[model samples]
Every structure is written in structure tokens, then in C-alpha cells.
Target: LGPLYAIDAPFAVNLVSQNGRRYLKASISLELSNEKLLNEVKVKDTAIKDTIIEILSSKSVEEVVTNKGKNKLKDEIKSHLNSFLIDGFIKNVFFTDFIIQ
Candidate 1:
């Protein structure tokens, strides 16, 4: 398998909050199937980041602060990104840092 590729910066998105303001800050890296897939990701980076922001902002603080919630989020991202890939799907999603505040 090829080595993993990643975006250079972390993602920070405001979350759905009822009582107060909340935010999700995460650093995500992807394990792509091949270099071609990496290129595809780069080409669609804007759309991908937008989707991620939408997803993160859609969730409540409680929903993304736990392990289960994080896993679900990872799956959702992988699935969504995979849908647009013509070369190959992302094999995995790695969170180098994840925090909710």
C-alpha cells in the first residue's frame, strides 16, 4: 500500500450548541489507496473541507466529544469522501488531534 497523505492544517468548525457556544477542532489525515487518489483529494479539497465543516457543525458538542461519536464521525467522513473519488476510496481516516470546546 502507498503511504498516507494529509492536509497540512487542522479543521475547526463551530458546533451546534444549546446552552453556549461550542466548537470542534480536529486534525485529520487520510490513508488513500494510491497517489492518484491523493491527487483526486487535492483537486476536491475545497469541497471536501466544506463537507467536513458541514458535518461537524451539524453535530452537538455532546455528540462529538466521545469515542463512539468520533468513530461515527470518521466513518461519515470516509463515506462521504469516497463517494466523490473516481480513482480509489480513502482507506482510513486518522485524527491526530480531536477536541470539542
Candidate 2:
């Protein structure tokens, strides 16, 4: 809920639906925020980048666009990032930019 982490560069997240034909693309940007961490350990930048790429590559458009689906994604993301962060550093995962095509 505070200042958001900015995505230093532009990138695209693609989602493949169960149908296997519908593809949704979500443009994303990530910013490193100022949230405090539970621990002082470092979160490898590469790990974050790789995780984001994985999320983008696998997330379907429907899952991102729809509210219900987005909530699911949010949960998944939070779970996926827990090990990387200091147990609460990630306040939120924003869909800063979205494009479905």
C-alpha cells in the first residue's frame, strides 16, 4: 500500500489457458519497494527476475484479467516469493500495465 516497486524495463507476461488456444499478454513492470523484511538476508535480484519471468510465462490472460483469477495469481505469487523475501517484504504485486492480445 505504500510506494510501489518500479519495473526498470518493459517486459511481457504471457498466459496460456486450459483450452490451449487463448493467449493473454500482460505487460509488467517491477519496482523494488522500501518495505522492511523479517530478516536481513539478501534477496538475489536474479531470483526475483527469474520468478517474475516464470509468472509471466505461465500465467494465462484470463487468470490475470478476471478478478477471481487475479486473486488466485496474487496468492500464488505471494507463496512463490515467500522463500525469497524476508517473510513479508513484498507488500503487493502490481499489474502496473496489462495488455491482452
Candidate 3:
């Protein structure tokens, strides 16, 4: 069979509120592409999920919302993933839907 195109997973993130209160009510959807990497990544979903959450959790809302900060996280994710997956197999990691209320 040929390579796959995408995979989606749900994630929850805990963040520090403006008042320094740690809140955990946000959920995010992750989509990873690159058929060759899909199966391998799926098998290692735990690590992928942890890595993503680690990065996201470390950032404040401002950092994630800012283009530079967003790109920094993106680069970190891509670098981490590329180390394990086939070159260029995973094209993108995106947030399909996210909400924190």
C-alpha cells in the first residue's frame, strides 16, 4: 500500500492563568502527515503526544499567539519528530481546533 496522508489526535493542555493560577481546561487537535512516518509515529504516539504537550505547556498564551513564538514551537516539534521519522515524511503538525475557556 501507499503512504498515508494524515492522523489526528486529541490533547489537553494545562496553562498558568493571568493571576498565576494553573488552569487545565484547554483541548487541542493534532494532525500529523507523511504516510511513511504515520505508522511509526502512531506506534510511538505516547512520545509524540508528550513532546507536543511539553512544548505547548511550556509556552504562555502570548508566546503561542505570537508568530515568532508559534514558529519556534513549530520548529522544535519538527526537529524532534524528524529525528525519529523518515526525512520529509511528516510534512506538518497543526492545530485543527483549540479552545481554552
Highest lDDT scorer: 1
The ten-residue window of minimal lDDT in model 3 covers 23-32
Provide the clash count, candidate 2. 6
How accurate locally is residue 93 in candidate 2, as Cα lDDT from 0 to 100?
A: 64
Candidate 1 segments whose C-alpha is farther than 4 A from its true place:
none
Model 3, 36-96: lDDT tens per residue?
5556776877777787778767766666656686567667776776677663445545555
Model 2, 1-101: lDDT tens digits are: 44455545555554676765554444443323454442321345567667766876687666577788776776666567656675355656666665666
**Model 1 alpha-carbon miss at residue 70, Å:** 0.4
Clashes of each: 0, 6, 1
lDDT (CA) for every model shown? 0.86, 0.58, 0.59
Candidate RMSDs in order: 1.2, 4.0, 3.9
Number of the predicted model whose TM-score against the real structure is largest = 1
TM-score of 2: 0.63
Higher lDDT: candidate 1 or 2? 1
- Candidate 2 weakest lDDT stretch, 10 residues: 32-41
Candidate 2's C-alpha runs over 4 A off are: 17-43
Identify the runs in model 3 with alpha carbons over 4 angstroms from their true place.
1-7, 16-18, 22-34, 86-88
